[PDB]
Amino acid sequence: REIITLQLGQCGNQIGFEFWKQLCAEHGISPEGIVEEFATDRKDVFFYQADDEHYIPRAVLLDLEPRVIHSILNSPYAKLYNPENIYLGNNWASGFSQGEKIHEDIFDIIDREADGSDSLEGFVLCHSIAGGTGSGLGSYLLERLNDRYPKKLVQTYSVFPNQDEDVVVQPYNSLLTLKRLTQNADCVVVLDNTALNRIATDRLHIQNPSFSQINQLVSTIMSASTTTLRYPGYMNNDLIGLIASLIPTPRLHFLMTGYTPLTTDKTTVLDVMRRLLQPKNVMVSTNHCYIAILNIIQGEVDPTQVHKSLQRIRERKLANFIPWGPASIQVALSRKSPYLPSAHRVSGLMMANHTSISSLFERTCRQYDKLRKREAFLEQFRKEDMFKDNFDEMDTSREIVQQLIDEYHAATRPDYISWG
Amino acid sequence: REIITLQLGQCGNQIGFEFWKQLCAEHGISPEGIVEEFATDRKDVFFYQADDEHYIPRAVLLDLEPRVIHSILNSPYAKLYNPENIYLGNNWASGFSQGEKIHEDIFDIIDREADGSDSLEGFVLCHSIAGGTGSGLGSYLLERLNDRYPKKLVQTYSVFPNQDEDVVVQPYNSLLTLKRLTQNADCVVVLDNTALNRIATDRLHIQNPSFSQINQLVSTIMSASTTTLRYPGYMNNDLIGLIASLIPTPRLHFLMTGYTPLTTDKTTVLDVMRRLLQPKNVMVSTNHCYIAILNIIQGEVDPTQVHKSLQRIRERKLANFIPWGPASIQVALSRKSPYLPSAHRVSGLMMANHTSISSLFERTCRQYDKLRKREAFLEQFRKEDMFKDNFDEMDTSREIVQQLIDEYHAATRPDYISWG
Amino acid sequence: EYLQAMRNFFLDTMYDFYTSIFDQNVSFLNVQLQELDGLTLSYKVPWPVDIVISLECQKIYNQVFLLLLQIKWAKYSLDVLLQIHRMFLLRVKLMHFVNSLHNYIMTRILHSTGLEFQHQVEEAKDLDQLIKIHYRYLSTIHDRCLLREKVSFVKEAIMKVLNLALMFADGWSIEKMESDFKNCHMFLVTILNKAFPHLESLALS
């Protein structure tokens, strides 16, 4: 149903601001909120129907030692939102300890925004793992959402720190936050710095300003994933029914996210499905195969081509899956948005669970272990000491992700009556 | 029925003069009183039918050490009224002692204006709490109206001194005058300096000339509250029947006053009711809920929308009230004035009793107590000593307002067979 | 203009007209107008207007004028103040309902149909259809205001809940009013649920 973006981390606040200006350009609205004269469709998934048809976006801004709010303040997006929703470190443990003492008023902010909405179903998070301020505070917020709301959803659109081995404290923080995301979040959409950066270097001619184009890529991905919710289709437009088909394996909830236009500047659905199953078009980094696949096609589509494309895709064995059930590739259709300022309105998306992400997780399972053996990169921060005296929480996270690896490899088998 | 404005205080005389020039612009009248050629409707609520169709406004001007009468004298509003109605300190106690010695001729002025009118039903007061000259003299006038006229109404349109903690003598004066307003006045419309000042800083770009725009805001509020009395509708056009629905709890007679255009420079009644129940549109500053709500809609209104708006407003649970009876939200309709010089004739008003005002009252219940403990801000004025030797009248006012707080909190309960 | 004046005389000046009645000679009140049940009065209608205005017209409006006088009578009697606490509850248990009834009588009946009927008669270009829309306004206000039947189980409840305000006004014991009130309220809401097809708007109140 209706979901409220909780932005946290520096890149998380960047993709939150980019997402709101993307939705301001997408919908027929002013930068005050007033309805335009070119804008019935639904505008109630992220926007409250406020005073003068002011579609005020429902958002939560969280950070520590504020940086980006100045860029919000001198912009016309301090006149679109903020009726009072903006709240003002460098390690997971420092962020955890800082979020421990101010858990009351941030939980009051969560309660205020839950009372502000009209139908609460899930809390979507626009977050960056090891963004600085996001690490630790984000995991503690995930623990608070799991403890206080077991009946609602926790969605995490997130990028994960991979530099292909830069920063020597981020594998500890990412593994601990990944354990918190397994136990305290309901669905994770995984993205990577190397995958988005490599595709950005491919489709463009940049290498240094990676952040500003990663904001555009993540905003387009998030708008494509919520296109069928914001603009009315008639399939599974609640978040619960949409993610219900998307997760085949109840512990393996990390989803591949491809996008057939890497740059948005003719084609059939067969060709973009053949494109979309290739990992080079996917922004996500032995026997690896999917468990269940679903794809969403929006544009100037002929539905009988969706028929023949599904027929040929599953029969030519490019949907690669050996499940313990019948779980399969799924087609889905969406209506492309009226009054996009973007041209070339044919666009495709895939949301599938693949075991190949386990190999990328194994790199993190290497890195922490490697940095535990050299012992000059745990850095002996005192906040890590007061977090846990035995430092066995990192071993617990390693155990949880090792169970995750064994569950991926058991889901490759036709039996899931045994995992390691 | 017919009510006569008793202006007192500096801001009280300012809103009185602003109210009379507002009614001069509102009605088709000259600044002498003569009927125009664009002006049957009723002009008998504030105006006597004098000599040459001179609609002379019935008013009482009271102050001490005159300041604003010079601005009245060099204006064409010394030719609209004053056939002889204008009468010429800084503390509540000095004003009380000054009003004690000249109670005879001011009561003669009240008798003269009561004999001047044709149907006396209530004495409406345009007053400012701690305006300087208004403090003390206003409370003594309230005592005189309660003693001499128990059979008539006392209406107080008033602003209350809140600076968010400026002047260190105003909490004593406001608490004593508030006790006098509870025991000696029949209905109080409460306004605040911070609420009107904050909304003035929001809708405009001012901060220093707060008084001149507070005059405009209070004049528009008072004209909106008396629109159905001045211009004939057919619901409860006597003051007694109008305030009869407005007060649900016989000691809690402090009414919220919202106004859907903050600036008067399309919309349905559902949207302005959703706007109007929000406290950000209200010019008035835990479990808080209303007891009974009433709203008045005047403009280009379709009455079946008043139906469907009332249906959806009470069923979606945005009318928040837990009463000890069935007391509810009420709709009311009014005709917008013919020949307003104002454009955008759709305007809404609410008159509701809310317990949240108790919290604002609690701030005053803090302040006097705080200033009683430091003991450098009672200031030991000798007029306060001759008012009461034991200084127990302030404790009596604190007891009365504490009973008021407990009565608000008992009215939140479904039982009013017990208050504290 | 006569229609506006007719709904101004049956249903400003009327509150003065009733404050004379609050504490008699009924022709005196006619001159006072000219500047719980019972009672009749008449005023003359001129002939070229009385051939397009019915005679049954006056009866139907006199009924609802007496009803509105009873409504203002209970609203004025129930405000009498300007175990000791117990009296306060018997205000609001009563003070809302005769007022919430006032929300159904005024807006849902006397303001929708009353405003549209004046607009309907201005657009007529024939003498017959102006009489016919007048008669079909009389019949639909004969159905909206219940003057027909089931008025020995519905209208008597409406009368007696105004009578309770009179009994509270005299009493200014208390516990024997609410037992009658909740009983007639339960009967009213069990009858007015769907059993004309707009009476459910007060059963929720």
Swiss-Prot record, chains A, B:
Transmembrane segments: none annotated. GO terms for biological process: cytoplasmic microtubule organization; meiotic spindle organization; microtubule cytoskeleton organization; microtubule nucleation; mitotic cell cycle; mitotic sister chromatid segregation; mitotic spindle organization. One of its GO terms (cellular component) is non-motile cilium. The keyword Nucleus does not apply. SMART domains: Tubulin, Tubulin_C. Phosphorylation at Ser-119 by BRSK1 regulates centrosome duplication, possibly by mediating relocation of gamma-tubulin and its associated proteins from the cytoplasm to the centrosome. Pfam families: Tubulin, Tubulin_C. GO terms for molecular function: GTP binding; identical protein binding; microtubule nucleator activity; structural constituent of cytoskeleton. The modification Phosphoserine is found at S119. It is found in: Cytoplasm, Cytoskeleton, Microtubule organizing center, Centrosome; Cytoplasm, Cytoskeleton, Spindle. GTP binds at A130, G131, G132, T133, G134, S135, G136. Keywords: Cytoplasm, Cytoskeleton, Disease variant, GTP-binding, Lissencephaly, Microtubule, Nucleotide-binding, Phosphoprotein. Belongs to the tubulin family. It is linked to Cortical dysplasia, complex, with other brain malformations 4: A disorder of aberrant neuronal migration and disturbed axonal guidance. Clinical features include early-onset seizures, microcephaly, spastic tetraplegia, and various malformations of cortical development, such as agyria, posterior or frontal pachygyria, thick cortex, and subcortical band heterotopia and thin corpus callosum in some patients. Component of the gamma-tubulin ring complex (gTuRC) consisting of TUBGCP2, TUBGCP3, TUBGCP4, TUBGCP5 and TUBGCP6 and gamma-tubulin TUBG1 or TUBG2. TUBGCP2, TUBGCP3, TUBGCP4, TUBGCP5 and TUBGCP6 assemble in a 5:5:2:1:1 stoichiometry; each is associated with a gamma-tubulin, thereby arranging 14 gamma-tubulins in a helical manner. Gamma-tubulin at the first position is blocked by TUBGCP3 at the last position, allowing 13 protafilaments to grow into a microtubule. Tubulin is the major constituent of microtubules, protein filaments consisting of alpha- and beta-tubulin heterodimers. Gamma-tubulin is a key component of the gamma-tubulin ring complex (gTuRC) which mediates microtubule nucleation. The gTuRC regulates the minus-end nucleation of alpha-beta tubulin heterodimers that grow into microtubule protafilaments, a critical step in centrosome duplication and spindle formation. This is Tubulin gamma-1 chain. It comes from Homo sapiens.
From Swiss-Prot, chain C:
Disulfide bonds: none annotated. Widely expressed, with highest levels in heart and skeletal muscle and moderate levels in brain. It is found in: Cytoplasm, Cytoskeleton, Microtubule organizing center, Centrosome. Component of the gamma-tubulin ring complex (gTuRC) which mediates microtubule nucleation. The gTuRC regulates the minus-end nucleation of alpha-beta tubulin heterodimers that grow into microtubule protafilaments, a critical step in centrosome duplication and spindle formation. Component of the gamma-tubulin ring complex (gTuRC) consisting of TUBGCP2, TUBGCP3, TUBGCP4, TUBGCP5 and TUBGCP6 and gamma-tubulin TUBG1 or TUBG2. TUBGCP2, TUBGCP3, TUBGCP4, TUBGCP5 and TUBGCP6 assemble in a 5:5:2:1:1 stoichiometry; each is associated with a gamma-tubulin, thereby arranging 14 gamma-tubulins in a helical manner. Gamma-tubulin at the first position is blocked by TUBGCP3 at the last position, allowing 13 protafilaments to grow into a microtubule. Belongs to the TUBGCP family. This is Gamma-tubulin complex component 5. It comes from Homo sapiens. The gene is TUBGCP5.
